[PDB]
A paper describes a structure:
Invertebrates possess a different gap junction protein family, termed innexins, that is essential for eating and developmental functions in Caenorhabditis elegans and for electrical synapses in Drosophila7. We recently revealed that the C. elegans innexin-6 (INX-6) gap junction channel structure is a 16-subunit oligomer, that is, a hexadecamer, with larger dimensions than those of connexins. Here we report the atomic resolution structures of INX-6 determined by cryo-EM in combination with GraDeR.
We first attempted to reconstruct a hemichannel of INX-6 as semi-auto particle picking worked very well. A three-dimensional map was reconstructed from 74,398 particles with C8 symmetry, and the final resolution after refinement was 3.3 Å, which was sufficient for de novo model building. The map of the INX-6 hemichannel includes part of the densities of the extracellular domains of an opposed hemichannel. The Met1 to Gly6 residues at the N-terminal end, Ile52 and Gly53 following TM1, and Glu370 to the C-terminal end were not assigned due to the disorder of the structure. Two helices (CLH1 and CLH2) in CL and four helices (CTH1 to CTH4) in CT are arranged in a helix-turn-helix motif, aligning vertically to form a cytoplasmic core. The INX-6 structure is divided into three parts: the cytoplasmic dome, the transmembrane region including a pore funnel and the extracellular gap region. In the cytoplasmic dome, the CLs and CTs are intercalated one by one through the eight subunits, creating a dome-shaped pore entrance with a 30-Å diameter. The inter-subunit interfaces are reinforced by the polar interactions of Arg168-Asp153, Asp175-Tyr356, Arg178-Thr318, Lys182-Ser317 and Lys183-Asp351, resulting in a roof made of consecutively placed cytoplasmic cores. We found additional densities inserted into the inter-subunit space. These densities could be assigned to lipids carried over during purification, which may serve to stabilize the transmembrane bundles and may also contribute to the conformation of the N-terminal funnel due to the proximity. The N-terminal loops are harnessed by the cytoplasmic dome, and the disordered Ile52 and Gly53 cause the flexibility of TM1 in the pore cavity.
Residue numbers in the entry:
A (entry chain A), B (entry chain H), C (entry chain G), D (entry chain F), E (entry chain E): 7 to 51, 54 to 369
The structure:
Amino acid sequence: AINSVNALISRVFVQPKGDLADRLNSRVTVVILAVSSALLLSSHFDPITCWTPAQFNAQWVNFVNQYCFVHGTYFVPLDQQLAFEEEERTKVSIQYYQWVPYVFALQAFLFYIPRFIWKAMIAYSGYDLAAAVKYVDRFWSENRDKDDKFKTRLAAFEGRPSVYIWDGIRLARKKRSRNMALFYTLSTVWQAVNAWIQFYILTQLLDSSIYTLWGPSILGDLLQGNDWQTTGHFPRIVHCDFNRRRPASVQLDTVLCVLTLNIYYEKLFIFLWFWLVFVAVVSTVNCFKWIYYLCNKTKAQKTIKNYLSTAPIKSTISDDQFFSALGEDGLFIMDQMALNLGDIPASYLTISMRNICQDFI
Amino acid sequence: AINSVNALISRVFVQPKGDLADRLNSRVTVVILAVSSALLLSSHFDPITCWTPAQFNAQWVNFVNQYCFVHGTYFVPLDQQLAFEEEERTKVSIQYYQWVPYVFALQAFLFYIPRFIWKAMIAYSGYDLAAAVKYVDRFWSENRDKDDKFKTRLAAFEGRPSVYIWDGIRLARKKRSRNMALFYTLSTVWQAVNAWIQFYILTQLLDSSIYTLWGPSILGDLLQGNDWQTTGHFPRIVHCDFNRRRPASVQLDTVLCVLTLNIYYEKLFIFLWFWLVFVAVVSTVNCFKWIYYLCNKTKAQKTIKNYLSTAPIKSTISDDQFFSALGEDGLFIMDQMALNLGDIPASYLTISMRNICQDFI
Amino acid sequence: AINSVNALISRVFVQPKGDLADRLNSRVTVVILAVSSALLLSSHFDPITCWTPAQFNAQWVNFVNQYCFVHGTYFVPLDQQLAFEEEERTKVSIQYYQWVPYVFALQAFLFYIPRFIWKAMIAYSGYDLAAAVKYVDRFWSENRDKDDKFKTRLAAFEGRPSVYIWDGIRLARKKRSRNMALFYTLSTVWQAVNAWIQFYILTQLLDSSIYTLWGPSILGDLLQGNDWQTTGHFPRIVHCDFNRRRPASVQLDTVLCVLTLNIYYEKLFIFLWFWLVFVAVVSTVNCFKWIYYLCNKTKAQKTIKNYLSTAPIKSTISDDQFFSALGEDGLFIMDQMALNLGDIPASYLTISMRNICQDFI
Amino acid sequence: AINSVNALISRVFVQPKGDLADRLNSRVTVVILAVSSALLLSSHFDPITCWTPAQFNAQWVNFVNQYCFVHGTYFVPLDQQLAFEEEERTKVSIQYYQWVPYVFALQAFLFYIPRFIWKAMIAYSGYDLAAAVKYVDRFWSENRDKDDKFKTRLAAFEGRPSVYIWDGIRLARKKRSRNMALFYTLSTVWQAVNAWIQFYILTQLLDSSIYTLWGPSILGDLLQGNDWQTTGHFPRIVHCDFNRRRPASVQLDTVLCVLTLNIYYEKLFIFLWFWLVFVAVVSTVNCFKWIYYLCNKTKAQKTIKNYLSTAPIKSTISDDQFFSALGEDGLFIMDQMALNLGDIPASYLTISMRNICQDFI
Amino acid sequence: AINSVNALISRVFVQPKGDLADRLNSRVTVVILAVSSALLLSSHFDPITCWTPAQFNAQWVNFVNQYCFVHGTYFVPLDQQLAFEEEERTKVSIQYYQWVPYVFALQAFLFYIPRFIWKAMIAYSGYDLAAAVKYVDRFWSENRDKDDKFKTRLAAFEGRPSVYIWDGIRLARKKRSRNMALFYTLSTVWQAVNAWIQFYILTQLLDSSIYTLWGPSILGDLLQGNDWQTTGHFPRIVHCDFNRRRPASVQLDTVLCVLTLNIYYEKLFIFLWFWLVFVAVVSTVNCFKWIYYLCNKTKAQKTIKNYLSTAPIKSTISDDQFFSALGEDGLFIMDQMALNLGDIPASYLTISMRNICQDFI
């Protein structure tokens, strides 16, 4: 059959509204890992097929099938005979079927957490950016078109939106926010550390006792033409111990089982390793951006002092004390308005807020 | 069954808005290679069928089927007997089933990257073309029809849109853009090099040790009537080594397996080679266009100096110093407006911007 | 099952807007050949059934089925025995299964190319007919109904649309178009040559070594009652060589296989030959029309000089010098407006353009 | 399963707009023959079942099934033994499975051609009736309701629609139409001859060597209770020659096969013969109508001279010379307006055109 | 499975607009007989099952199944032995499977013809009732609600609708209609005779040689408890002659086949006989209504002379000569307006037409 779900993918992939730069790799990460996880445990609707001997009546084949899938499997390159005891034969032991498809779902969830941390944390800060942005937005969606306001366009932002934002600041500033920028940079630290932990989980996945995977080694093998049977690891043909019961208890034998899933798993561990290390390095530089921002803060004002330089007629109020009134809170939320509404609609907003800021400072 | 997906193909094939010339062969390339890849690994919902001997009970047939698919296969033209050892029989060894259907998906993704590079890079440059184009666009969609503005049509562009664009330039020009044209031509260099690398991946695909494919050789064979068995390569009937286990370990035999997929794969490697070399040569000339543009730049102004020659009443301001004010940034974004909105609506825009450009120069 | 796709057929069959006369046989050709191709390789969801002898266990039947389909088949009229060697038996050898269903898809694509050549070429010429036609169109869709403009109807075309068209000509005429008519007639030459090449591909299809098909011979046989077995070619019952492997290598035998597809293929090669030769002869006369047009050009003006003869009040400007101003470019685009908008709405447009043409000549 | 397609049947059955009287039996003919054809080759999703002897293993049953379907079948009434040689047994030979379901599709197409001839031919004539009719139509759809125009209703047709039609005549009359009526009557001759040829194809279908079908003979048999086995023709139980291969080559035997399709085919050849002869005789009288029209032409004016007799106030212009101005072209297009818009809305149009016709004559 | 088609049943069952009294039993008749016919030949997706003896291998069971269905079957009450020869055993011979399900479809079509006769015939008469009724209808749908016209309501019908109808009469009366009432009563004669012929076809169906069916006999048996086996006719268990072929030719035997369809067929021949005789007697009285109408015609005017008796203020014009002007044509179309629009909206129309009728008489 075929399964194509457009809508549910569009829910996370689209619906929640933000343009946040490359923080939307949480949005797409959840989709990739969620779809891969839900696809693998779907078993491509036979995971494993086996050689079980002549006289089994085919209700046992459908048994030794699972009993090989559930109980572990192992591998030996072939011609070593079987070795002996339980050890040298079981030395290389490949069962990651138990982990991978579920631990991916867990991965995806742990990529979704940081957004939740940011929503709950901004609701803790007291000043909601979602409402403000969606407001000044549609203010800019209405009268951008209307020709009645252009020569007035500057004075239009003065009354209606700028009093809304500048009014929200008065309420928030009395409740648990001068700090909301700090809360944001903690959110992005959590983003980075989360990414690296996920990557490390990919590495330590499979089993650390038998190697570990990271891409340029595997591609540095395949592209040398080492396949599997001559590379000594990661096989597609696995022997399977097997146990009946009689008054002689164990009665174990070895039945080799061709193994399909191992053709997918290491075709997508070459991709998904590159893509997770990419999400890691693009998420970790975004963090140092904001520690730099939070630290220097004298060059955090370059964008605002830049917008105030266009400033038709440049009326009166001085520069510094405007930052004295706006400094802790608004200096951030402006860096948010520029990121969503665009650039030019923000400059009008921050040049209007300079005119009406008196009573507060 | 039948699978027909119109919508998801229309998402990439349509939804993101641009007319960029023959840069939309990334758009269609992703569709061709993505659909081919997703179709091949669908196995036309039997990949390979085999001759396995008389006494197997049909749970082994369904085994030696995979065990032949997963483990490699090879070919010998027939009547050579089997030769001997492991080598002369395995000399020509055909397994590209492992690579092709997945490496196509990887291809498609690597065709989608350059668009991403251009979006992220223009967001780095500071001046967003998407917003501007979509703005002056619907400005031209509203009052193109309205009869109240025609004798005023020139003066209409003066106030409303031209102040928007010409205002965006003031903001961008202070932040990391005189260069956005250079960023664009780097994007197109990446486009070309990406295309040629993809083509080279097609060539080196299959296995370089046993020939390599490029079209006029294969068609230069088929159209001479060499099929396969007499051309010595690329078969549809492949022998398959096979291994049981007993106290005598290997016990290998040879069971020839009729092989269906090889009827598709080299029907679409004749097409897809031509089509990739075409995308290559149409993408590589588009690049030299922009290096020429970026270099000479005295003949990059021919279109603007051309629009200013229609110029009703040709009021006052001289020619050169207009380019002195507009030169680095706007000279590009105009070449973008002409490409999307059409030609005649752009000439009005660039003849209006000449009138209101004073304060900035 | 049943597959009925209305929408995707309506996309090519309808969506792209033009009335171009019998150039829409590219539009319908792509549909016929695409649907036939996609239907044939669907195998009418058994291509071939065979007689394979008594003791095969039905996993071999499902093998010799393909091994007969993939490896070639041949035919002998029956009672000749088998002849001998490999030659006299294989003299008539029927395998076109490999070619036909795919080479049809290739056909269809090569019918779609010329439209692409025309779009890209008109975008090279500098003056876009699509925008202009869709503009003066909906200008004629709005105020055709409105009763306020009829006595003014002539003066209505004067201001709004005619300045748009006549303004586009000023821009184009400075960039790489006096020639757009020539580009068009090259497009139609490509149309004709493309058609004849496709037809010749039908002929040389099957195999030229064993006859070739063209309709009045086949119908000139069937309607004489020659079927197949007595006509010596084109059978529905084909013998199939077959090869096992043992220490005696070849072990070939002959197993006759009833062959279904051959009932479809030559029911639609009687139709599709007629229909391609029709598309050829209707496409090739359309070409000589435009070479005649491009050559004489004194009788290319008959339609315009005809429209200017209705001409209420026939004000002032002389005849010839109007053509001197309009000659190279507009004389074409008018022959385009007449073809899409209809006839009477074009006459108003070309009688209005005579009034406002002064400044340009 | 069940297949019900409403929309595609509604496309031809409805969408193209015309009321043309009983020329819409092309419209419905295409539907009947197309649906019958597509239903028969669907095989009622077993065409033929057979008696094949005891020891065949059921992969041969599924062979001799086709090999009987593809290779011909014959019939003998039973108890004649088998006769002998190849002739007396094969005398009556029933295979129309090869022809019927496809030749119906061909029929349907050849019913659709004449409409195409009429569209292309009217586009050759220079004056498009589709646009005009759809125009004066919605002119009559708008202000039929509006109460502001009734006492003015006559004067309403004077300005807006009548100048449109009467203006189109000026353009057409200069290009290849005084004749469009003649083109129409050639179209209807083609209609009639096409119908009779189709009917004759039904007759000569099956095989002329063994009888031929026309209804009152078959019903004149069935309703006498002659079924098949006693009527000597048209059986439901057919013997089937069959050929193996051994060192004795032919080895033919006779295996009688119950035959289902023959229960449908002559249930719908009783219907479809009546219905085609009806379409023939209703289409052939429609033709003599228009040859009469084109010939006498003094009584072709009875409808117009009839409309001019209601004529409130009957102002001035004489009768004959109005026909002198309108005679060749408009006299037809009026007989078209009466057929689509109805009758009363046409009389207003032709009584208005008498008032404004001066300048043209 | 399940098949439920609402829309196609709603097309005939609803879409064509008329209230014609009990002439809509053609509308519902077509649905009943069409659905029954299409359901029966669907075989309730096994028509007949049979006892065929022990040693048949189940590819013969699936043969003797059809060979019993196609070739006839017969019946004997049981214990008579088999009798002898071919006659006494085959005396009662039940095969109506061949006829019934198709002859029902033919029935339905022959119920649909009379509507077609009426549409074509009214289009022959020259005055189209469909347009008029649908016009004065929506005239009554608009201003019935509007409160501005009530005291004016009488004068409202005077200008707008009544001039439309009374104007159509002037055109029609000059072309082939004083007679349209006569055409209508011929249509209803055809309706009645058609109904009785259909009923007689039900009777003579099955086979007249073995009884015939009409309801009160069958129910007069079942409700006496005569079932089948003791009533001597109409069985559910039928013996089936059967023929192999050997050098002894016939080799016929008798294999009794349980027969399911016979449980449906005479459950719905009890219903459908009553329902057809009802449609007959309700359709035949509707006919004598109109012969009475057409004949006396002095009491055909009772409804109009009745409406003119309400007549506010009863202005001037006498009674009889109004009928002299309206007599042949309008006297009918009024009896049509009363049947569709209702009664009270018609009285206003016929009291308005009395006021404005002067010029015509």
